[PDB]
Amino acid sequence: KLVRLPGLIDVHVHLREPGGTHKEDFASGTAAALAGGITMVCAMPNTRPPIIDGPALALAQKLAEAGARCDFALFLGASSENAGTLGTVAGSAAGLKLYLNETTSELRLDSVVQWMEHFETWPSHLPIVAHAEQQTVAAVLMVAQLTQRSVHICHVARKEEILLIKAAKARGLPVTCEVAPHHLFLSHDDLERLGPGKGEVRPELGSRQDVEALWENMAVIDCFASDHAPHTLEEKCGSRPPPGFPGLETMLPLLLTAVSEGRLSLDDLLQRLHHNPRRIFHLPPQEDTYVEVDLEHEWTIPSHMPFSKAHWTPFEGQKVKGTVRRVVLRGEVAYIDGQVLVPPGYGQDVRKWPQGAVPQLP
């Protein structure tokens, strides 16, 4: 007997197109999404070229429309040059992404004043999300308060961070956050097995106490999001390993296992992979869209999942219970038992749907 879930939403994926298509492209990354029970993704802007200007966004939109198999929205990225220039295209994006820790030269902000300028110029009704670790959480929260608006914190990974956000919520501040599965299901205890290259990720893997704190503070976590960050094994195992894990194909099975064990409820999962993504990012419903899962099937994660071009996974060897059997997307069968059945280009930019515009005052 299968359980019918709504179309799940992953608000944090790296699909690598343009410019990194040996790691993933829209077609392979959205195949991975569908096989993970995800019907809508929000793609990050740290591509090559990065999505930091209108021409780059226009290119990425066409590449996504041609390659995506599930629906999507595309983030814009903040740069040291683009504050006050994105007003005409801002509403067509998922939101604005700020990379506030170590990043590329194109996305690097060298001063908190540049963060302020983005918060002051980006349209006030549109989402802002930040890669903000440790004290950077507190710093970006201060900028948000100075500019009188909300912020969403990506991939919270530490006891320190979740407790800070908890304290901010207790003071009524408009902050939301997401957590990635590797910060719930892996820790320092796994670094020996992974090795130093595969184990590289930002935020880094936490201690057992960090992991425990995230679970104990589940009420503070608004969303789950994979931070699907595919790189090839050659890259992960080479001399300058890039940080990141693929995660679209493993996120839902890992979380269903936890539901099975009573660590969180099915509702808790659906708030965090459906309702709260919708409401924080003002993402539209997908008509005639659902995911059927088998909660009884026990399996072991293999050395690579079928679809991501990363062709490796840090969750190899973990025992999970729960699997995606079928996905229907806008009335068409998109996935059954390991076969993706919608072509590249089936997916659409949800920000172009009438119901997908973010409401604003005239």
Ligand X SMILES: O=C1C[C@@H](C(=O)O)NC(=O)N1
Is 349 catalytic? The answer is no
Closest CA to 277 of 7, 76, 3: 7
* Closest CB 154 distance from ligand X, rounded Å: 8
Burial class (CB in 10 A: 0-12, 13-18, 19+), 360: exposed
Of the pair 227, 349, the CB lying nearest Zn ion is at 227
**SS3 call for 145:** helix
Residue 154 in marked binding region: yes
Residue 158 interacts with Zn ion (CB under 5 A): yes or no? no
* Closest CB 46 distance from ligand X, rounded Å: 5
Helix or strand (DSSP H, E) at 207 = none
Of the pair 43, 340, the CB lying nearest ligand X is at 43
Closest CA to 309 of 247, 250, 231, 251: 231
Residue 244 interacts with ligand X (CB under 6 A): yes or no? yes
What is the three-state SS of 166-197?
A: HHHHHCCCCEEEEECCHHHHCCHHHHHHHHHH
Kindly identify the residues of this chain, within the stretch 217-236, that bind Zn ion according to CB under 5 A: 227
Pick from ligand X, Zn ion, none: which does 201 bind, CB < 5 to 8 A by kind? ligand X
Pick from Zn ion, ligand X, none: which does 12 bind, CB < 5 to 8 A by kind? Zn ion
d(CA 263, CA 148): 36
Q: Using CA atoms in the order 267, 14, 350, 335, what is the torsion angle rounded to 10 degrees?
A: -70
> Across 181-278, where does the E strand assignment appear?
223-224
Residues 6+ apart with CB under 8 A from 316: 301, 302, 303, 304
Instruction: Determine the residue with CB nearest Zn ion.
Output: 154
- Tokens representing residue 37 in the block: 């029970």
Residue 131 interacts with Zn ion (CB under 5 A): yes or no? yes
User: Residue 323's beta-bridge partner residues?
Assistant: 294
d(CA 100, CA 109): 7
Residue 131 interacts with ligand X (CB under 6 A): yes or no? yes
* Closest CB 44 distance from ligand X, rounded Å: 7
Residue 272 interacts with Zn ion (CB under 5 A): yes or no? no
User: Contact with ligand X (CB under 6 A): which of 98, 157, 221, 229?
Assistant: 229
Residue 183 interacts with ligand X (CB under 6 A): yes or no? no
Kindly identify the residues of this chain, within the stretch 4-23, that bind Zn ion according to CB under 5 A: 12
Q: Which residue type does 261 have?
A: E
User: Contact with ligand X (CB under 6 A): which of 201, 280, 293, 320?
Assistant: 201
Instruction: Determine the residue with CB nearest ligand X.
Output: 244
Q: Which residues bind ligand X (CB under 6 A)?
A: 14, 46, 131, 201-202, 229, 242-244
Instruction: Give the active site residues.
Output: 227
Q: Which residues bind Zn ion (CB under 5 A)?
A: 12, 131, 154, 227
Residue ranges at the known binding site for Zn(2+): 12, 14, 97, 131, 154-155, 178, 227
